Design a protein around this ligand. Structure first.
Ligand SMILES: CCO/N=C/c1ccc(OCC[C@@H](C)CCN2CCN(c3ccnc(C(N)=O)c3)C2=O)cc1
Lengths: 245, 58, 297, 50, 58, 58
């Protein structure tokens, strides 16, 4: 009655019989931009069902040695379905997100994944190792797309900050002996009412194993982690030709 | 005082008690802030809240 | 007009962001109530499910037998203004006589407070901040001596001409705000408003400022947000002839009327550069102290 | 006199032994009532937890 | 304050809110000016005004 | 003045008359203290008080 759940939006429905409730980032549901917060004057377009639906974008394999991965929003969807087209044809974009991370195993497997959302997740480099070289991360690392990217130094989140304090952000855990999914609802987070879906990534989704995956020889060794997400209250403005970046 | 409303906190959910001698409010002192807190926004942002006595997962 | 049902009953356009939580006044630490032994089935405060993502709701009252304690300890000193409204160093400007830096009697400093660790680490606890600020300017020679010298500080906002010499025409300062003061006078001090084009300044921007191909040679612009670039602070000795004294200007900032959003993990690796969170990859250190065994102090 | 709360609200000294059961008159063996077939879910008198 | 009315704006179509410590009003601060505007005086000084919808020359 | 109650004597059995220009009461002057005295607490802390006329030990 808190373990079972159904998430229906658009022409897609998700089910889970081993949930752990739902998290609503910073305690507030997504919403459309009010006429007093807005600034751009053109009438926005709100596609609704064609873009506010669940998209399953990627599957990673959880291994005994995995370090963790991250994805950037809205980067992950800029080239998928109708949402992508609208993000490409419009200068302005804004929306919320419902993130559903899936990972099931057996009552004999163990391990725990920390699933968290970190706004304005700026990536840092190791500065040439000695820290005397001012290097910068490449586009494929700041905006990895749907395939995401693997963390090199999870302890410091590849940005000189302690992952041990990541729980100060909207998060959930996937502890195999307890639940097989994590659901986080995120409102639009920015210092502006609208912004570019291409140049700016509002937040990053981190999925990091804190307690290593383990099991005995003979049990299914392939344990996938699938990422499904849905935009909420998508709004677009500033129409012109399509642009990919 | 009849000054300008150009402070960074003009229209905040917490009222301040400040001092100023200029026509621009941001020139004012820091004053005292309102002692309101909302821990749940960070410590308990769950959709369906669960009691203390009961078992969180049922 | 609207006639088909799905349109009439849609929530498309709802601008009211529903909030699950609300603030309550809390001027003092919560009190402790009396409690006694409880030997029940069904009731179990001690057991939690951290997976949910929420913190424990268990309290002293339900874990041990407590007494009543009227707690009158204030919560005042932990407000944002209490924490930040304390002047700290955020900039140094040298005006040497014989040097390799600013030997021409003037200097331009890009307003950027991320050059000093103490102040930087405090503001980076939050992602977005909006505030006014009080700036204090302390000048003296490199020995701390006070000399009879007149200086001119001028705030050059983006787009205004940056002085290129001690006698530059821009010092006419007909529109930009300038402060003329003596090293003998007390430190100059002024109030600065919230000047960003955005609703708040942001210590982190996971994006690029422009469109196009973001090739290797432009990656230095990743994370650069013009909304945070307030301009230049220029200083000069006032005269057509070189100064007789070497000078140093220390810049202190005191935030006030502060609002902050989105807390984040606190820096645990030394800082290296102003513009980014780069860290020395070969010196990744634990967040804190360590010990020999988990079973020994 | 008593003033601190934990003292006022304590049960220290309660001499009344609370009893969970009480005696009923039973001069004869209990009777047997009529019963019929029952084909229900949820109801399960036969299953116990010794 | 009972001072002299020797300010450059004494008798202006816009009232000001100023501070002064001397008997001569021009010694006063700049204060705040009235936020009235009349763009038409420059942007549309036509004798017979024409609507937006209609065609200016008919 | 609406300031903070952070003085060392806030809630004392003797009221003070002070001056201050800051939001923190401890910044205030010393002022004047209340002229109350209780010598007996030290000079005569006996359980059963004995009169002056009578003999202390009877
Ligand atoms: C006579 C004239 O006297 N004039 C004085 C005077 C003094 C100070 C003035 O301006 C104060 C603006 C300050 C408060 C903004 C500091 N901020 C906000 C965001 N941000 C920032 C964010 C992310 N990254 C970086 C980064 N560097 O990588 C940097 C900042 O540094 C203006 C005028």
């Amino acid at each position: 009655s808190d373990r079972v759940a159904q998430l229906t939006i658009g022409n897609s429905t998700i089910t889970t019989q081993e949930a752990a409730n739902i998290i609503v980032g910073y305690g507030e549901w997504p919403s459309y931009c009010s006429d007093s917060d807005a600034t751009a004057v053109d009438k926005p377009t709100r596609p609704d069902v064609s873009v506010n639906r669940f998209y399953t974008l990627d599957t990673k394999l959880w291994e005994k040695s995995s370090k963790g991965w991250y994805w950037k929003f809205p980067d992950v969807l800029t080239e998928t379905g109708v949402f992508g087209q609208n993000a490409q044809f419009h200068y302005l974009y804004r929306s919320g997100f419902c993130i559903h991370v899936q990972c099931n195993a057996s009552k004999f497997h163990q391990g725990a994944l920390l699933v968290a959302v970190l706004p304005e997740y700026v990536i840092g480099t190791v500065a040439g190792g000695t820290g005397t070289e001012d290097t910068h991360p490449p586009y494929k690392q700041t905006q990895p797309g749907a395939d995401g990217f693997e963390l090199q130094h999870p302890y410091v989140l590849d940005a000189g900050i302690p992952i041990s304090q990541l729980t100060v952000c909207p998060h959930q855990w996937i502890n195999l002996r307890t639940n097989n999914c994590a659901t986080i609802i995120v409102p639009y987070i920015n210092a502006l009412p609208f912004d570019s879906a291409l140049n700016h990534c509002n937040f990053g989704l981190l999925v990091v194993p804190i307690s290593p995956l383990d099991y005995d020889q003979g049990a299914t060794p392939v344990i996938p982690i699938t990422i499904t997400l849905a935009p909420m209250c998508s709004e677009f403005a500033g129409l012109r030709q399509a642009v990919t970046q | 005082s009849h000054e300008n409303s150009n402070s960074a906190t003009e229209g905040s959910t917490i009222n301040y008690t400040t001092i100023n001698y200029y026509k621009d409010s941001y020139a004012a002192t820091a004053g005292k802030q309102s002692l309101k807190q909302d821990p749940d926004k960070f410590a308990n942002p769950v959709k369906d809240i669960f009691t203390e006595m009961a078992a969180p997962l049922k | 007009g609207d006639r088909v049902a799905d349109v009439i009953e849609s929530s498309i356009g709802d601008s009211v962001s529903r909030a699950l939580t609300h603030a309550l006044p809390a001027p003092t630490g919560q009190n402790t109530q009396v409690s006694s032994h409880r030997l029940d089935t069904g009731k179990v405060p001690a057991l939690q499910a951290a997976e949910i993502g929420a913190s424990s709701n268990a309290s002293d009252e339900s874990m041990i037998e407590t007494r009543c304690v009227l707690n009158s300890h204030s919560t005042a000193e932990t407000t944002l203004d209490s924490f930040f409204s304390r002047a700290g160093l955020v900039g140094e400007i040298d005006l040497p006589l014989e040097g390799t830096t600013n030997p021409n009697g003037y200097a331009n400093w890009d307003i950027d407070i991320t050059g000093y660790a103490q102040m930087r680490r405090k503001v980076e606890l939050f992602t977005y901040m909006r505030f006014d600020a009080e700036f204090t300017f302390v000048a003296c020679t490199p020995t701390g001596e006070v000399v009879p010298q007149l200086l001119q500080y001028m705030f050059v906002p983006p787009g205004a001409p940056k002085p290129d010499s001690r006698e530059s025409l821009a010092w006419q300062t007909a529109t930009n705000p300038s402060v003329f003061v003596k090293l003998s006078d007390p430190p100059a001090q002024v109030s600065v408003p919230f000047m960003s084009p955005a609703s708040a300044y942001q210590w982190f921007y996971d994006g690029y400022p422009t469109f196009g191909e973001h090739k290797q040679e432009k990656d230095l612009e990743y994370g650069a947000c013009p909304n945070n670039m307030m301009g230049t602070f220029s200083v000069r000795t006032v005269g057509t002839s070189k100064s007789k004294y070497p000078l140093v200007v220390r810049i202190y900032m005191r935030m006030k009327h502060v609002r902050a959003w989105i807390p984040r993990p606190m820096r645990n690796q030394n800082y290296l550069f102003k513009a980014n969170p780069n860290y020395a990859g070969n010196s990744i250190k634990p967040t804190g102290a360590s010990r020999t065994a988990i079973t020994t102090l």
